[PDB]
Amino acid sequence: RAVVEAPVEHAPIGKATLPSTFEDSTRQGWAWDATSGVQSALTIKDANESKAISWEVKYPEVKPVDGWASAPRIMLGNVNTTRGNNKYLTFDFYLKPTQASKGSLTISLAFAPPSLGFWAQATGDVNIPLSSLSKMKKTTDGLYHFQVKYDLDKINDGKVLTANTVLRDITIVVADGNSDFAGTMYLDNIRFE
Ligand SMILES: OC[C@H]1O[C@@H](O[C@H]2[C@H](O)[C@@H](O)[C@H](O[C@H]3[C@H](O)[C@@H](O)[C@H](O[C@H]4[C@H](O)[C@@H](O)[C@H](O)O[C@@H]4CO)O[C@@H]3CO)O[C@@H]2CO)[C@H](O)[C@@H](O)[C@@H]1O
Ligand SMILES: [Ca+2]
């Protein structure tokens, strides 16, 4: 299936780049998956004094049964990277809610390794409770700043990512955990470490 809307003015696609810093004002190869429930503009905005890729999302009040149907699902296609000696994939994730009071966001990471049936999913989903936020100190520019880590030795289905396993694509999903989130999200500094 494909989720479609009228043409939207994304920032320039650029070229797949890791670490993804967005400093060249392009998306450095990141784009919505064709199945992403969110297909609105991906742009390059300042977040916490750095350029970051960004979108808006307000999850529906009536929640789909499939837990990713409404989710931003952003992908770095055909990067063809490997983890090397790195234990983690990590990135900066920022929120600027207009509404956030209940439920959670559940952030997943996946890869498409051609040797592993084009899917390998990190086991360590990260949940951000929205009631936790009001008590969190914001950045100077009014954001909630998370640095999210995924231990690449914890992968579902017994699949193993070795130092040399080709990762064709990287996917990040920000799923709705029965939440009332509305507002802006941002990614920066997407990298292995
Ligand atoms: O639905 C929510 C549920 O999702 C689970 O993850 C699903 C994904 O939602 C789904 O998009 C993903 O589909 C993959 C599939 O696994 C790959 O095998 C397939 O690979 C393609 C490849 O991309 C092509 O280039 C190649 O030519 O063909 C191969 C084989 O078809 O690509 C599709 C699309 O990326 O499958 C996931 C695992 O089932 C989550 O695991 C779960 O947590 C969520 O709740
Ligand atoms: Ca940046």
Side-chain angles (χ1 to χ4, degrees):
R1 76 174 59 187
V3 181
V4 295
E5 54 172 278
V8 342
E9 197 183 310
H10 303 297
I13 178 72
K15 294 157 20 78
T17 303
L18 288 166
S20 310
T21 70
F22 306 105
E23 293 305 319
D24 62 9
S25 290
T26 74
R27 288 182 292 141
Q28 294 188 318
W30 287 88
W32 298 127
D33 191 78
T35 72
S36 180
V38 178
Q39 291 291 331
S40 58
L42 285 163
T43 60
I44 306 315
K45 293 190 168 165
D46 291 342
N48 195 35
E49 290 213 301
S50 191
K51 286 178 179 284
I53 191 164
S54 183
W55 63 92
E56 289 289 322
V57 49
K58 173 161 66 176
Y59 294 107
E61 275 173 56
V62 175
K63 320 279 176 195
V65 174
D66 180 289
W68 285 5
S70 66
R73 171 174 171 168
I74 196 176
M75 179 173 71
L76 184 59
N78 289 341
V79 64
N80 287 125
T81 192
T82 63
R83 70 185 281 198
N85 304 308
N86 290 113
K87 181 68 175 177
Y88 289 102
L89 185 138
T90 192
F91 45 85
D92 295 301
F93 176 64
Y94 304 88
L95 303 174
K96 189 181 191 174
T98 61
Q99 178 61 27
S101 77
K102 54 183 173 198
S104 66
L105 304 180
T106 296
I107 313 172
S108 293
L109 176 70
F111 304 92
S115 69
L116 294 169
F118 302 89
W119 197 256
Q121 185 162 325
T123 300
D125 290 337
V126 182
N127 189 254
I128 295 175
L130 301 193
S131 66
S132 77
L133 283 185
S134 69
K135 290 165 43 271
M136 183 181 183
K137 182 170 175 74
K138 292 181 189 163
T139 61
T140 60
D141 56 332
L143 310 181
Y144 302 105
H145 181 188
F146 296 89
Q147 177 197 345
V148 189
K149 308 183 76 182
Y150 293 90
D151 174 350
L152 304 171
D153 295 322
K154 296 178 177 183
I155 307 296
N156 292 345
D157 300 337
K159 292 177 172 178
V160 178
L161 306 185
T162 76
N164 263 45
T165 298
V166 173
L167 316 174
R168 184 193 66 191
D169 311 328
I170 306 177
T171 296
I172 297 166
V173 179
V174 186
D176 184 17
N178 211 54
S179 93
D180 65 348
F181 186 89
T184 314
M185 299 187 174
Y186 318 65
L187 294 161
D188 205 358
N189 305 120
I190 307 169
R191 57 198 189 279
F192 293 105
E193 74 163 23

